[PDB]
Every structure is written in C-alpha cells, then in structure tokens.
C-alpha cells in the first residue's frame, strides 16, 4: 500500500462558479439510445428463460386441466 511518482498538471474551478442542475436532463434521448443499444443483449439474456419457462408451465397446466374434464 504505497504511492507512485506521477508528473501531471491539473486546473480546477471553484464550486460556486458553475451551473449544477442543468446537466441531468441535457440530452436524455441519445443517452437512452446508447444504453439500450449497449445492453440489449444483457437484457435479453436476463429476461429470456423466465418468459420461456412461464409460458411452458402455463401451457402444460391448462392442457392437463382441460384434459381431465368430462
């Protein structure tokens, strides 16, 4: 647990000299599109098996119930 010699240069500005809130809602649709396009595969892989198993169980149960009738 130690540190390293670095050699960098940085500039900063005071907190009380810059607008804070307007950054949240600036350009939402492009951010939403980027997130969706990047994580569509993760969403698919998370939500696939649940839907498949649920549909299969529903179909099996209704078929069995309707086949037990008179």
């Amino acid at each position: 647990k130690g540190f390293v010699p670095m050699k960098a240069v940085t500039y900063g500005l005071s907190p009380f000299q810059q607008k804070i809130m307007p950054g949240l809602w600036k350009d939402l649709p492009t951010k939403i599109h980027h997130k969706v396009s990047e994580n569509w595969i993760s969403a698919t892989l998370l939500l696939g098996p649940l839907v498949g198993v649920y549909s299969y169980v529903q179909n099996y149960q209704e078929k069995e119930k309707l086949s037990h009738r008179y």
Binding site: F3, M6, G12, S14, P15, F16, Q17
Partner: protein, 48 residues
C-alpha cells in the same frame, strides 16, 4: 496608521477574509497537499 485599532481590523477582516473565494498555485511534490474544498471550507468557523 494609528487610527486602525482592533475593531477596524475585525471589520476589514470580516469584509475581505471571512467566507470568500481563493486562488492557489503549487509546484513540486504536491501530491500530499489538501484539495480545494479543504481550503474553501476552512475560511469560516462553526464554533462561533
């Protein structure tokens, strides 16, 4: 000059020092120098 007593010192200090912005510049091995917010908060006291 001799018309600047303790009360005037406190008045001018509370006009210029207390709770105002600062400017810093450092050079060298300054990796262990406190960040901006440390200095900025230390310009007033919560004890008083």
């Amino acid at each position: 000059i001799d018309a600047v007593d303790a009360s005037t010192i406190k008045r001018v200090a509370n006009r210029f020092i207390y709770d105002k912005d600062i400017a810093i510049a450092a050079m060298g091995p300054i990796q262990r120098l406190p960040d901006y917010n440390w200095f900025r908060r230390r310009t007033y006291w919560n004890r008083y």
